[PDB]
Structure formats: structure tokens, C-alpha cells
Design a protein around this ligand. Structure first.
Ligand SMILES: C[N+](C)(C)C[C@H](O)CC(=O)O
Length: 591
């Protein structure tokens, strides 16, 4: 069995029934509306269904007739490539490598040693992919889309004046040649070397020399030009700085392409985030912040190495979703466990070429842009607050409802929530929106805060909330959600220069969460001991992510300090109390 052999058999992403979608939409706005607003919205929705919507839906169906996935391109453009704000900090997702829970605790001086092995395992995974030996993901006996795995290596974003683009150079052995070099960023400089020698992958010892030549080459000297820092800028500025940097030297384009085509970017930091099984929130902060001088935000996969031998990943969210990064990070974690975090093979170091530096041609302007880029990224990042902890009836649904109660208790109002739902059952299926803030969830929350409420009432309502969410999560993953659907109708109109339907201008549309207005941006990152996070979706919002182990729940919450009403720390505390309260309500209501 080969990794991508089921791609041609995957079913097309479906288009829900118009009426079904609108009904789910109408139901979702209820928690945020009174009689009048609701009736107003209901009227708007009915006219839509009968008129414009029916026609835009018909056009959406025609689009699906010619595309195995009608959403693919639109989603990439409207959710990522078209956005102009700084993506590195505001869209990229990060995740700490959990190797410090066992064999690789935080410890100065282990940076180059562990790093050599980090590269070795990562590269073995790449080889696994290139040979299509990576196991096909399956739900029962149903194969899942594996296309996002093509975006892990040799993939990089390229800025545009109005729209960025994605460059995917990866290729399987069957498809042809694939870049075989990695790019290392250090002290504002960029080096690259071939990971192959005489046909086979270079061993850790050899990988150690390569990182040694680079580390020294710029360790006793001040930082370099830091062209990389420009990747953390507003998308248009970066696009302008790039065109310029190139106009100075036609060769600069060649260096940029070297970085873009590399299997991935390895960043060597000098900072040391406090990383321990108890406190690791700091790892998230330096992962999303850090020193822009050695980060290539446009890279789909940027492995980060700190001084205390701690590791983390920062990825461009545009080409793929977090599950691919979670998979390799976990694969490596397992490799570390089996080898007790050590290389026990040959110590020989064959005579392989030394890392070649990429010396960009710059002037006074570029250096100013570089200086500005660092300042804006660092300034913006300092406003970020991260709270990470471990807590020791589907687990995901349990956490989602607990978050609803927690937010409800902390802010005294229902929090419109976005929960990611994977739709990989379909060709190139990525995600769908699950709206956790349902009528059921709210009624349950109220009862939880209702002194006169009985235990039987509370559990009965909590259960109805679970049933509603489970169903919702199931339907959404099966392509029966409505968020992407409504987006498609809107995009059908826009693409033809037709006016924006009144449906989207409705105050309730955005109050319920539409238009990227969810106060709670969330997602389960899996069951593979790896955790990640991103910044909130709105200034007065929260970012809440988590992963589930058979013995604990691990969460990571983000919030903006500049916003006085939110506090990531207190929310995490609140959800833990919510977990507890929900526990008692289940054990007590045992009879
Ligand atoms: C950050 N968040 C949850 C809003 C988006 C997800 O990470 C990806 C998605 O749902 O497409």
C-alpha cells in the first residue's frame, strides 16, 4: 500500500442542500438574538432561499460539477493568500516538540547534539514520504485525504502585492526529482547543504558537523543582514521588499529560491524558553515571537532549535492544516523514545561538502526594511499572552462544552465559538466550521448557573448539549456543515461582480460568528502528545486549542494584552473548574 494511492478514489467535496444549510444557519443565530432580530433574520433567509440564494446555489452546484473540490482554491485565497496582515505572527501555527517530557529535558549545551538527531529523524520521515511508505490515514476502512503531506517539505509561500502564492516543489520518487537540501538560518545569515551523500541520507554525526560549521562561522561575529526578518511583515510590504531585493541583484532571486525549495528551514535561536512538563507556555511565546532574523515565516515547515536544547515548529497555515505537523512531530517523538534520545550507530563522519552560505546582495534601503520588520513583529508579538496547562461522552465535545460554560461564567455571555472540523473524507478536503455555541449549550450553561436548578435538570440538559454537538461534529466532518457553503454562495456572487446578498450584511450574521468574528477560535490538535496554538481571531477574542491523551487533557490559550476584557490565564483556570464541575454533576447524578 502506497501513501497517495487512494487519492483518485476519494469522493468529491459535497455541496449541502440549500434549505438544510439555511436552517442550520437560522438555528445558530438564536443564542444571539431577541424576537425581533430573529424574525428579521428569518425573513431575510426565506427571501434568500426563494430568490438570489437559489440561483447562487445552482451556480455553486455547476462549479462542483467540474471540481472534485469546489472549495479548495477559494479557501486558500480568501482564508490565507489574500489576507494582508502579517501572517507569520497572526496566522502561522506553532507547536513545541514534547521531547522534554522524557529523554530531552531542558539543558544548556545540548542544542547541536539533539539538533543533529532532530534533523536525522525529520529527514527519515521525508524519505518515508518520498518513497510513499508513510501509512495511509484511515477512518475504519475508509481512506482519508493525504494531499496535505505533500506540503510538509520543499514548500514555501511567496508574497504578492495583493495575493500571495504557494510553491510546492515536493515530489515522490514516482513523480520525479525532489530538492535534497535543507536551509539553516543563523545569526541573520542563511546556509544550505545536501542531506544526501553517495545516495543515502547523512547520519547524525555528519549532521552535527554541518551544524557546527555554521554555528561557528557566525558565532564570534555580529548578526548578519537578516533578510529573513522581512517574512514577518505585512504581506504587501514584504512583497515590495522582495521585488526590490531582487532588482538589486538578479542572483538574489536564486538565493530566495534556494530557501523556498529546501526540504525545510532549520532555525538556530540563542534564547532559552523555560520548558518543563509543568511550565512550557514560554515555549509557545518564543515560538510565535522569537527573533525574526532567523525565521522564515513563508516556509510551510520551520523547525526551531533553542539554546537549552528545546525544540518547536512554526508553520505557514496557508498550504495545510496542523495535523500534518502533529504527525511528523509525533513520529520524531517516538523515534526519540525508542533511541532513548541517542544515536547508537556509526560515529564515522564521511568527507561531505561544507554548508554553503547564501550571501544576499543588499543596500541601505533593504537594511532599513529589515530593521523595521523586526521592530513591528517584535512589538506586535509582545502584546500576545499564552496560557498552557495540563488537566489530570466524547472528550472533544466535553472540552468544547466546558469552554462554553467557562466563557459564559467569565464574561457572563455566550461566546460564539469556531471549532475546526476536518473533512478529509473528501478529495483535498481540509476543514469545516463547527459552531459550539448552540441553543442547547446555552440552556445548559444557564441551568449550571441557576440556583433553583435541580441536578437532574443540569445533567439532562448537559447531555442534550453533548448529543447536539456530537451530531454537529459528525455532519460537519461529513461535509454537511453550512459555513463553507454560505461562503461559496457569497464567492459565486463576487466572482461574477454581482452584489453581496443582504444575508451577509445582516447584523446577526457577524454576531453569530460570520466574517471571521468568533470570540473563541478553537480546535482539537489530535491525540498525539503534540500541542499547538495560534493567536485569537479577534482582538477581544481567545485562541483555545488542546489535545487529548488517555490520561489527561492539555490546553493552550491565547489572548491579547492590549484587550483589558480578556485574560488567557483566567480562562484556562475557569475551564479546569468547568471540567471539575462537570465531573461532579456526572458522578453525583449516578444514583
Ligand atoms: C485557527 N482556526 C481554528 C480558526 C482555524 C483552524 O486552525 C483551521 C481551519 O479551521 O481551517
Amino acid at each position: 500500500e502506497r501513501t497517495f494511492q487512494y487519492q483518485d478514489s476519494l469522493p468529491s467535496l459535497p455541496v449541502p442542500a440549500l434549505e438544510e444549510s439555511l436552517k442550520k444557519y437560522l438555528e445558530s443565530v438564536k443564542p444571539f438574538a431577541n424576537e425581533d432580530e430573529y424574525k428579521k433574520t428569518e425573513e431575510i433567509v426565506q427571501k434568500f432561499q426563494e430568490g438570489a440564494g437559489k440561483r447562487l446555489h445552482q451556480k455553486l452546484l455547476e462549479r462542483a460539477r467540474g471540481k472534485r473540490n469546489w472549495l479548495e482554491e477559494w479557501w486558500l485565497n480568501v482564508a490565507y493568500l489574500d489576507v494582508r496582515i502579517p501572517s507569520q505572527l497572526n496566522v502561522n501555527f506553532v507547536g513545541p516538540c514534547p521531547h522534554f517530557e522524557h529523554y530531552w529535558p531542558a539543558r544548556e549545551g545540548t542544542q547541536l547534539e539533539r539538533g543533529s538527531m532532530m534533523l536525522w529523524h525529520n529527514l527519515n520521515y521525508w524519505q518515508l514520504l518520498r518513497r510513499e511508505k508513510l501509512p495511509v490515514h484511515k477512518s475504519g476502512n475508509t481512506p482519508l485525504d493525504m494531499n496535505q503531506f505533500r506540503m510538509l517539505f520543499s514548500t514555501c509561500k511567496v508574497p504578492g502585492i495583493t495575493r500571495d502564492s504557494i510553491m510546492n516543489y515536493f515530489k515522490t520518487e514516482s513523480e520525479g526529482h525532489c530538492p535534497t537540501h535543507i536551509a539553516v538560518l543563523c545569526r541573520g545569515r542563511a546556509f544550505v547543504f545536501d542531506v544526501l551523500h553517495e545516495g543515502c541520507l547523512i547520519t547524525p554525526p555528519e549532521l552535527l558537523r554541518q551544524l557546527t560549521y555554521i554555528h561557528k562561522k557566525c558565532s564570534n561575529e555580529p548578526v548578519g543582514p537578516s533578510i529573513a526578518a522581512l517574512t514577518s511583515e505585512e504581506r504587501t510590504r514584504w512583497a515590495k521588499a522582495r521585488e526590490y531585493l531582487i532588482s538589486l541583484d538578479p542572483e538574489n532571486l536564486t538565493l530566495l529560491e534556494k530557501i523556498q525549495t529546501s526540504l525545510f528551514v532549520y532555525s538556530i535561536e540563542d534564547s532559552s524558553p523555560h520548558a518543563t512538563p509543568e511550565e512550557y507556555s514560554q515555549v509557545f511565546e518564543m515560538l510565535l515571537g522569537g527573533d525574526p532574523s532567523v525565521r522564515w515565516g513563508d516556509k510551510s515547515y520551520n523547525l526551531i532549535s533553542f539554546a537549552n536544547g528545546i525544540f518547536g515548529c512554526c508553520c505557514d497555515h496557508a498550504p495545510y492544516d496542523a495535523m500534518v505537523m502533529v504527525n511528523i512531530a509525533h513520529y520524531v517523538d517516538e523515534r526519540v523514545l525508542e533511541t532513548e534520545g541517542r544515536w547508537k550507530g556509526s560515529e564515522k563522519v564521511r568527507d561531505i561538502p561544507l554548508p554553503e552560505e547564501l550571501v544576499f546582495t543588499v543596500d541601505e534601503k533593504i537594511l532599513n526594511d529589515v530593521s523595521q520588520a523586526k521592530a513591528q513583529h517584535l512589538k506586535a508579538a509582545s502584546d500576545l499572552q499564552i496560557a498552557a496547562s495540563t488537566f489530570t461522552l466524547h472528550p472533544d465535545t466535553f472540552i468544547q462544552l466546558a469552554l462554553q460554560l467557562a466563557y459564559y461564567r467569565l464574561h457572563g455571555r455566550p461566546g460564539c465559538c469556531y471549532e475546526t472540523a476536518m473533512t478529509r473524507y473528501f478529495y483535498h478536503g481540509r476543514t469545516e466550521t463547527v459552531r459550539s455555541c448552540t441553543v442547547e449549550a446555552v440552556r445548559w450553561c444557564q441551568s449550571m448557573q441557576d440556583p433553583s436548578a435541580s441536578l437532574l435538570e443540569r445533567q439532562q440538559k448537559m447531555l442534550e448539549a453533548f448529543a447536539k454537538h456530537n451530531k454537529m461534529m459528525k455532519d460537519c466532518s461529513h461535509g454537511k456543515g453550512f459555513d463553507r457553503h454560505l461562503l461559496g454562495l457569497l464567492l459565486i456572487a463576487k466572482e461574477e461582480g454581482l452584489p453581496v446578498p443582504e444575508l451577509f450584511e445582516d447584523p446577526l450574521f457577524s454576531r453569530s460568528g460570520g466574517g471571521g468574528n468568533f470570540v473563541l477560535s478553537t480546535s482539537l490538535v489530535g491525540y498525539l502528545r503534540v500541542q499547538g496554538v495560534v493567536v485569537p481571531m479577534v482582538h477581544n477574542g481567545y485562541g483555545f486549542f488542546y489535545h487529548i491523551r488517555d490520561d489527561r487533557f492539555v490546553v493552550a490559550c491565547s489572548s491579547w494584552r492590549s484587550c483589558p476584557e480578556t485574560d488567557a490565564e483566567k480562562l484556562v483556570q475557569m475551564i479546569f473548574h468547568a471540567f471539575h464541575d462537570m465531573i461532579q454533576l456526572m458522578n453525583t447524578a449516578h444514583l
